[PDB]
Design a protein around this ligand. Structure first.
Ligand SMILES: [Zn+2]
Ligand SMILES: [Zn+2]
Ligand SMILES: [Zn+2]
Ligand SMILES: [Zn+2]
Ligand SMILES: [Zn+2]
Ligand SMILES: [Zn+2]
Lengths: 95, 261, 48, 157, 68, 299, 292, 48
């Protein structure tokens, strides 16, 4: 079984849940957007969320200019770059 | 003399008041060999120094003054020395008398006694190289230092001129607003090595500002070693002072051949 | 200290000298954390 | 014969109850000196080792002045304190020599510990150290030795 | 020019062991190498400990030790 | 050199020689000595040299931070005790329907405040104004001149605090409300009823307060809690303490809502008797009164 | 060869003045600073009662190829750094001599095992080839922004007032400062003039110089020092309208002064680098108007 | 238990009276020559 299975087991989840309650872990490399921005919390928390969005920007931006030869995919890639751009701004308003 | 030789050096931080030796938890399990945190990501790991040097307050005679110590206390510069007057190293701003003692010694190692290296570190941080007598510091990371006050482009330079003037004789201070960074050049390298460790991870706030209670929450400013100055208005100054250094050495060197004959 | 110098912080050495993994291990970790006879035979002497 | 009061251990002689409250004060300071006070400096960590060698010295100067200087305890008590390890047998035995009167410890006279074949510098008289520093034009650089923190055991000072 | 070994107090050993509980400081970097390079001598320390084990008619047993 | 000189120079040493110079939380201490349970605890605000601990035996025992003195003079259980900053005064309040002042200098009762209807469970000293704030089963707050009566809470008032700026009185009651009081107009400025009895409050030394309940400790300008079964104290280090009646000491950070430690006290030489009734920090230590008849010191 | 190894190359001034020095040999001590490859660490102390251990930082092969000592890494003859040595020989042979060094670890090791000399290490270690170049050094000694709106700033610079005794001010305005002439050299020249030496202890004077605007100001604490700064300056230049200006006199340079009569602060000179260059360009005319 | 560390000698062990060991009673009329010294650590160590 691939490490996708081994990473999501109960014990690995348990110590992250302690590290939330004992320190400054959590990472944020784990979780989603989260769907709303007005429901987000303090800024020092959100800066790491915002930093994560920059990193998928850099993956997408490096992916745009390639000769993948797929006009549909690069159209899709410009769409995520545009939504992550609009996403990068909504955290700035939240900041 | 009146500011320094008159009094004795004072305990900056109590030994119970010293920070904990384990770092802030950025991982799941602590590692005992490498005193760091292992599992989990790596988060951040730069914080504002809780301590700072008040140079006219903390300076004084130490145990290293009577012993003829050449080297300055590293934790005096950080504002963290718990030994006070019982410390083996010096607790004062370097002067021409002090750097004259270090003159045979500064070539390979800094004013704090730490040995220099062949080439610089990749981010220009650290101790320094013995191949270049670098006397210019890159004052960077000012935004986290100010705690994101807008202040301006001149005020920021005023903070840099006030703080680094206490740490020794200055050749020049240049602030660049577009690059949001400063370049401080000292008269001696030993002041630049002292002021680098003194102003690493500090904050340019002063109390006269509202954020003084939140000075700890920020990131802290980076003092690192500076690169060469690329404008030819300064490049011509470099070969001019290198020319004067060469003429001052040839006079000293023909007297060696005069004595040798 | 030997376990932790090798970076094997996911292995817990008990006070009764039992060596147990703290989590479900990836394969690069199970290759890396495969201690030899001289570690375990030293560990079983200390258990005795 | 041990430190622990075992049943193989011999009961105390007559004069022990007079000197027992003094010996307990040296005993409770040794338990507070071994307490693991966590200090991060190496200049402070050996300094806590220097307090133990001081108290083991001061517990042994006490029994030395009881028996050899003031003759205030019996030989059967003084032999009992050595067997029960209240006093260092070999450290007292150096204090009886003419040159080793105020002997730091036993480690500061080992010729084999040092890099040279020399004693510790706390064995040197202070007026000898002032004389050599006077020719060098400086103050004397020695304050406390690394073995136990002494400041001069020379018998002349 | 040989004098014998100096017979330290028992508390001098005892403070050292207690001090080396939490080796988190930078001062312990040399002493961590000393713990790790002593691991080859540790089977000799187990034999000398188990051969001097107190027999059933003994409450306690003072042994003479050599310590780093 | 000479023998008389070396005899003189060896007396220059400060000692005699050879060492004379030529030049989480844990439990540190347990303190017994109250005959009954200990209800309230306050500390000297200037020097930190002493405690003032109430009791269920009607006495007050001043503990050294040893037992210094005993202050009798109440007929019933002393629910609250508060020490003044700018004055050398001690305001104690008990179940005997009286707020009694104490001159710390001579150790005698100076003043008795009157006209409470029933047992007075809270005293808080206003900082600047030389006022007293008392609250009780009267369901009203009385502002005493060391004048104003505030009505609103529909049940008994458990904890009361004072602050210099606006909303000068924060109050908490068993109608599960927390009100912020405008004392000059003598009416409510703001109502915070989000608790589902609020038995404890504590002021952060950030201009905020920490509000307690049975299972949820909130803050007011949350905290992650499972069933803790119910005092609060705020260190200057951010850490926020929570006393439980299930013996559990819930330590928390105030910024986060995070809970970093949960401890369990050892009862005594009954298992139901092991709660923590009151708690306070110094001006790096924690001093907690328990119903097992002991004061415990947490380091 | 591990059993046949050269003796260490250390300076005479590293060893110091004493005759017998007890030196400690460790056969594979640290690794070299240059080649990152192990060697025999020698370390020693100058006197017996010293407090500084002098270690050999580089191996003997890296010390031979550079012709430097192992401890202080200065040249064995002439006792100068390498960067100054290869610059002095470049003034003699009229070509650049330079020891170049690897930044790669496999080429730091490679460059050390070869038996060549590097840079000026052919010239030095030959006493005949060194002494004639010193003679060739001796013949060298026989030779021995128009778009900017700057008008908000020049109202605050004085530029129209005179350097007399009669105003009693703390601050002054120094213009005509070259891009050379460090900030320490102007405070030392003023403190030499007043005898208020070691001024940084008492903070008697505070000086701000831009080095882009070619202008600056120096503020005194204790206004009675201002009359000492006026009276200790003798030479002045009178502009042909009037309005006499004192000259500070750094070696070969001339720096003009006018009492500010208020505190200038930072940012009086400029708030942007492009903006400060035009103030030096603004002044250059007034200096030429003051002199000629 | 393997979770609890080896408890320190001085806070726990050293302060307590040890126990009685295994000793046969050694009848005095039949064993008078050995009963004074049989159960020592080193028997007759200081007898010259
Ligand atoms: Zn220091
Ligand atoms: Zn000594
Ligand atoms: Zn000693
Ligand atoms: Zn010694
Ligand atoms: Zn090399
Ligand atoms: Zn050298």
């Amino acid at each position: 079984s691939r490490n996708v299975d081994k990473a999501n087991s109960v014990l690995v989840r348990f110590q992250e849940q302690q590290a939330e309650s004992a320190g400054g872990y959590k990472d944020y490399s784990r979780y989603q957007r989260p769907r709303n921005v007005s429901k987000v919390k303090s800024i020092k928390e959100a800066n790491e969320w915002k930093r994560q969005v920059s990193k998928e920007i850099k993956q997408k931006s490096t992916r745009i200019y390639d000769p993948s030869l797929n006009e549909m995919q690069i159209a899709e890639l410009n769409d995520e770059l545009n939504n992550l751009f609009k996403e990068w701004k909504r955290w700035q308003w939240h900041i | 003399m009146t500011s320094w030789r008159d009094k004795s050096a004072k305990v900056q931080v109590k030994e119970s008041e010293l920070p904990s030796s384990i770092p802030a938890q950025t991982g799941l399990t602590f590692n005992i060999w490498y005193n760091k945190w292992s599992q989990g990501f790596a988060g951040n790991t730069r914080f504002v120094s809780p301590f700072a040097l008040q140079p006219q307050l903390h300076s004084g005679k130490t145990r290293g003054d009577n012993d003829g110590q050449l080297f300055f206390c590293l934790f005096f510069a950080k504002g963290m020395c718990c030994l006070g007057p019982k410390c083996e190293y010096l607790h004062h701003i370097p002067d021409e008398e002090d750097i004259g003692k270090l003159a045979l010694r500064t070539e390979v190692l800094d004013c704090f006694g730490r040995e220099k290296f062949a080439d610089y570190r990749e981010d220009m941080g650290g101790i320094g190289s013995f191949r270049k007598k670098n006397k210019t510091l890159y004052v960077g990371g000012i935004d986290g230092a100010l705690n994101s006050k807008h202040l301006k482009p001149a005020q920021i330079e005023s903070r840099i001129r006030f703080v680094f003037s206490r740490l020794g004789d200055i050749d020049r201070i240049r602030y660049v607003e577009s690059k949001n960074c400063g370049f401080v050049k000292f008269k001696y390298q030993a002041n630049a090595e002292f002021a680098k460790e003194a102003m690493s991870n500090q904050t340019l706030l002063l109390p006269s500002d509202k954020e003084w209670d939140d000075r700890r929450e920020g990131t802290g400013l980076l003092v690192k070693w500076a690169n060469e100055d690329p404008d030819p208005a300064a490049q011509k100054r470099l070969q001019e002072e290198l020319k004067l250094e060469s003429l001052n050495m040839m006079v000293h060197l023909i007297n060696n051949n005069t004595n040798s004959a | 200290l030997l376990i932790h110098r090798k970076g094997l912080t996911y292995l817990h050495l008990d006070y009764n000298f039992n060596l147990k993994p703290t989590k479900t291990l990836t394969t690069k970790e199970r290759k890396k954390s495969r201690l030899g006879n001289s570690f375990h035979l030293m560990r079983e002497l200390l258990k005795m | 014969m041990p430190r622990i009061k075992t049943r193989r251990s011999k009961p105390a002689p007559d004069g022990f109850e007079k000197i027992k409250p003094t010996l307990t004060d040296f005993e409770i300071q040794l338990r507070d000196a071994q307490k693991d006070k966590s200090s991060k400096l190496a200049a402070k960590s050996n300094e806590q080792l220097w307090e133990i060698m001081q108290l083991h010295h001061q517990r042994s100067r006490y029994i030395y002045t009881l028996y050899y200087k003031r003759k205030a305890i019996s030989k059967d008590l003084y032999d009992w304190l050595i067997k029960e390890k209240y006093a260092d047998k070999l450290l007292i035995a150096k204090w009886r020599k003419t040159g080793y009167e105020k002997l730091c410890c036993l480690r500061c006279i080992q010729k084999n510990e040092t890099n040279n074949g020399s004693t510790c510098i706390c064995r040197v008289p202070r007026a000898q150290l002032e004389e050599e520093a006077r020719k060098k034009g400086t103050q004397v650089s020695f304050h406390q030795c690394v073995h136990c923190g002494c400041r001069g055991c020379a018998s002349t000072d | 020019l040989y004098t014998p070994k100096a017979e330290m107090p028992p508390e001098h050993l005892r403070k050292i062991i207690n001090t080396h509980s939490d080796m988190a400081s930078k001062m312990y970097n040399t002493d961590k190498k000393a713990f790790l390079g002593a691991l080859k001598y540790l089977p000799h320390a187990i034999l000398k400990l188990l051969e001097n084990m107190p027999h059933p008619w003994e409450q306690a047993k003072e042994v003479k030790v050599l310590y780093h | 050199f000479t023998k008389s000189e070396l005899k003189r120079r060896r007396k220059t040493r400060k000692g005699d020689g050879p060492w004379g110079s030529w030049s989480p939380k844990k439990v540190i201490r347990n303190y017994p000595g109250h005959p009954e349970g200990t209800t309230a605890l306050k500390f000297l605000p200037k020097t930190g040299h002493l405690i003032l601990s109430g009791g269920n035996d009607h006495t007050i025992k001043i503990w050294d931070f040893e037992c210094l003195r005993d202050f009798q003079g109440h007929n019933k259980p002393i629910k609250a005790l508060r020490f003044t900053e700018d004055c050398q005064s001690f305001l104690s309040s008990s179940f005997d329907r009286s707020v009694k002042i104490w001159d710390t200098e001579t150790g005698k009762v100076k003043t008795r405040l009157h006209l409470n209807s029933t047992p007075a469970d809270v005293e808080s000293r206003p900082t600047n104004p030389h006022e007293f704030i008392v609250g009780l089963s009267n369901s009203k707050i009385l502002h005493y001149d060391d004048v104003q009566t505030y009505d609103h809470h529909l049940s008994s008032i458990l904890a009361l605090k004072y602050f210099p700026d606006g909303s000068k009185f924060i109050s908490s009651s068993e109608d599960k409300t927390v009100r912020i009081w405008e004392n000059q107009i003598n009416v409510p400025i703001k109502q915070i009823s989000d608790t589902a009895s609020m038995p404890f409050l504590n002021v952060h030394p950030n201009y905020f307060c920490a509000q307690s309940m049975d299972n949820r400790i909130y803050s007011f300008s949350k905290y992650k809690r499972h069933p803790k079964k119910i005092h609060s104290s705020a260190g200057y280090g951010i850490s926020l303490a929570f006393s439980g009646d299930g013996r559990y000491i819930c330590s928390g950070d105030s910024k986060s809502r995070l809970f970093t430690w949960d401890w369990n006290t050892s009862r005594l030489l009954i298992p139901g008797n092991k709660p923590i009734t009151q708690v306070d920090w110094h001006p790096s230590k924690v001093i907690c009164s328990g119903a097992a008849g002991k004061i415990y010191v947490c380091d | 060869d591990e059993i046949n190894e050269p003796p260490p190359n250390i300076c005479e001034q590293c060893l110091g003045d004493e005759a017998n020095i007890r030196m400690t040999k460790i056969p594979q001590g640290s690794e070299c600073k240059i080649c990152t490859l192990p060697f025999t660490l020698y370390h020693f102390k100058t006197s017996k009662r010293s407090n500084n251990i002098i270690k050999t930082l580089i191996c003997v092969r890296c010390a031979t190829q550079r012709n430097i000592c192992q401890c202080c890494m200065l040249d064995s003859r002439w006792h100068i750094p390498i960067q100054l040595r290869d610059h002095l020989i470049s003034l003699v042979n009229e070509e650049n001599v330079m020891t170049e060094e690897a930044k790669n670890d496999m080429m730091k090791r490679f460059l050390s095992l070869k038996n060549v000399k590097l840079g000026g290490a052919q010239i030095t270690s030959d006493p005949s080839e060194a002494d004639n170049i010193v003679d060739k050094l001796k013949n060298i000694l026989l030779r021995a922004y128009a778009s900017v709106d700057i008008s908000h700033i020049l109202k605050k610079l004085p530029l129209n007032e005179s350097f007399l005794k009669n105003p009693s001010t703390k601050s002054f305005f120094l213009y005509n400062i070259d891009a050379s002439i460090p900030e320490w050299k102007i405070t030392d020249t003023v403190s030499q003039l007043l005898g208020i030496k070691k001024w940084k202890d008492g903070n008697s004077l505070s000086l701000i110089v831009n080095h882009k605007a070619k202008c600056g100001g120096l503020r005194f604490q204790s206004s009675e020092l201002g009359e000492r700064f006026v009276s200790k300056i003798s030479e002045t230049l009178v502009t042909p309208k009037g309005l006499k200006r004192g000259v500070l006199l750094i070696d070969r340079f001339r720096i003009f002064i006018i009492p500010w009569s208020s505190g200038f602060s930072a940012a009086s000179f400029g708030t942007n680098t492009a903006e400060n260059i035009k103030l030096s360009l603004s002044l250059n005319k007034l200096i030429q108007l003051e002199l000629g | 238990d393997d979770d609890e560390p080896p408890l320190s000698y001085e806070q726990h062990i050293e302060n307590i009276e040890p126990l009685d060991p295994i000793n046969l009673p050694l009848d005095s009329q039949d064993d008078e020559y050995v009963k004074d010294w049989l159960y020592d650590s080193r028997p007759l160590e200081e007898d010259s």
